[PDB]
Subunit: 161 residues, 4 copies
């Protein structure tokens, strides 16, 4: 069945959790398997509504591709990034929803701010969740994301069993 084992960071204003989502395979007629739908590392952000109380129903998600993970784990202390997603980039609903995830170092070198912005021109909504992440917290992410990378890529099927 499924597995639920998120790594979570809960701060003053919001929470953030991360969990791998495996790729799917289509087993070929010929034999063996071919990767179908891509793996990602899924991030979930949700708002604080009173000390250590957070509102799960107002959560927004952001799917990190292998390449975006690649970019996160190779971030140095002084490095910054920003990723842009349209959920319906290729469909008829393109331009309606825009998500942006940014990872900004703080002056100190003591951590990062990770911020998810979700703008929805259909529902006319504009949400932004921001979570500070210490160096150790980000080192857990970097280590756990690096461990997960080969899995979300499907390369763990290449084992001498």
């Amino acid at each position: 069945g499924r597995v639920f084992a998120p790594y979570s960071v809960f701060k003053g204003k919001a929470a953030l959790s991360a969990e791998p989502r495996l790729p799917t395979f289509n087993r070929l007629d010929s034999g063996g398997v071919k990767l179908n739908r891509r793996g990602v590392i899924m991030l979930t952000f949700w708002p604080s509504v009173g000390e250590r109380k957070y509102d799960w129903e107002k959560r927004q998600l952001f799917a990190l591709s292998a390449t975006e993970v690649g970019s996160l784990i190779s971030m140095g202390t002084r490095d910054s990034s920003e990723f842009f997603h349209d959920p319906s980039m290729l469909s008829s609903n393109a331009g309606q929803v825009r998500k942006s995830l940014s990872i900004k170092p703080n002056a100190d070198g003591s951590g990062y701010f990770i911020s998810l912005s979700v703008v929805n021109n259909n529902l006319k909504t504009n949400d932004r969740f921001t979570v500070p992440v210490t160096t150790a917290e980000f080192a857990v992410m970097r280590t756990a994301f690096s461990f997960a990378l080969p899995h979300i890529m499907g390369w763990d099927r290449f084992t001498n069993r």
Copy 2:
């Protein structure tokens, strides 16, 4: 069943061992599994009582969370840390026991001192065990803790099997 395979460092005044402790899961009614109790890397310290003789009955433990491990593996040659635990932080026995684990570089850059202090205001006891750890010893810890991190986080359940 269980598994016992500690990595151990025995020095003049004390010993130190480290071993991962897996998280537990509750299998859901719906199907699949959800992480319940957290994994840690468990450290055990105990006193030397005569050359290469150590007193197992006087051992004290300290559970490293994923984030504390994160902080250890991202320690540089010149870096120092200190972690504070109350075993009964949330219960009625709060303030009775205080544990502190510190990791201090030595001047040389030749290793670290890892020291566990346990203060117990109930039994009116005050114990401190200190173990020097060479660079190679700590490199084993860093490598083995880094390997263990995804496991104590439960992320090893996310495998394409």
Copy 3:
């Protein structure tokens, strides 16, 4: 059966994909197994023929040995390499085909150019495919190749099961 899960980079002029190929073992009469044919990381290059359209039938391959992988993952930002293969080095067809794979940093420090040249004196052909690879893309390669290294070496058979 087999497994197909390439990591792919598609750029203006060409595409590049990488996938591990496991080593084979011969199970001994005595018992247990002995590595026979070597593992590699297989690269496949093929030409773009119109935006995001690529010509699979004109693909050329290059097999990275463990040592070549070793050399790739230990490449710094400013580092360059070049590998030379003769497919029939030891046979009677030596000198007919020459393959060369080069990895050159771009001035920026923003990525690399990976280029495969295939010269065939039998068919009198001369092909060259070039693919730019950002830092994040190469960080995925470095991480995924590093994860694959023990597998293509066969060292994953050494598990306490």
Copy 4:
């Protein structure tokens, strides 16, 4: 059964191969398992006797403990080490055999010399095998030894299965 999958480096004057050797466990009466005999990374050196011809019968071995591996993988470009073993350190045959393994950078930063010396005062023999190891070759060792470390430590038994 057993598994044979050495990583090998063959040079002008000698060869060197490395292979992990798993630890053994004693399954407890109570249940589950306890590590018994330690894992190591086993090195084998043997002499060249004519171009790409090597004399397997004159091989000498050296068992790298986890801590020695720790020391190898944390070696920098400019770093050197030397390890000393007595095969019968604790027995009555102490002082009869002395093995020494040294890893010396070459001036260039282009690789290392790894040299095994075996002195046997019983058979009055004195053997020394030396193998140059490029940066890429050593990067394979460092990566493969790092991957093997948790296994030779027995920490791979700690999996959420």
